[PDB]
């Protein structure tokens, strides 16, 4: 919880900023996401489309429960795609 | 040299595309960039300040060498960071 404001931000609210700054929102989500999911296989193809997905479905989950911080929310995707 | 167009595109020309799509470009460079550099230490965090950085100076290096493919270009950046 003692993380920088950007990292401690909620994924749902990340969409709010996305209209102004899609870059910093989609980047961190993708950059962390891919690196953190590579932890279980290490061959997660680096392609804009996959990232585009991680902020689409993830924010959808956030819409269901706002108690998910951006940092933890994407971690649930790590386990979702992390089914090896 | 037989890789898909986008990943076979030079860092210099990738910046050109960023003018139309800053996302796909800043993403892929930070995505694999951070993933590859973290493969040497894993002490490297993910921040929006890094994408801008890895696509800034690199495009300048590739401005001196248009032959530098995106993949190779980022490798050279890893070398710089891996220099400890």
Curated annotation (Swiss-Prot), chains A, B:
GO terms for cellular component: outer membrane-bounded periplasmic space
Keywords: Signal
The keyword Signal is assigned to this record: yes
Keyword Signal: yes
Disulfide pairings: none
Protein name: Uncharacterized protein YmgD
Gene designation per UniProt: ymgD
Range within the parent protein: 26 to 109 of 109
């Amino acid at each position: 919880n003692g993380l920088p404001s950007e990292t401690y931000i909620t994924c749902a609210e990340a969409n709010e900023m996305a209209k102004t700054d899609s870059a910093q929102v989609a980047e961190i989500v993708a950059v962390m996401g891919n690196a953190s999911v590579a932890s279980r296989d290490l061959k997660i193809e680096q392609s804009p489309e996959l990232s585009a997905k991680v902020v689409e479905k993830l924010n959808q989950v956030c819409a269901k429960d706002p108690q998910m911080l951006l940092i933890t929310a994407i971690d649930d995707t790590m386990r979702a795609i992390g089914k090896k």
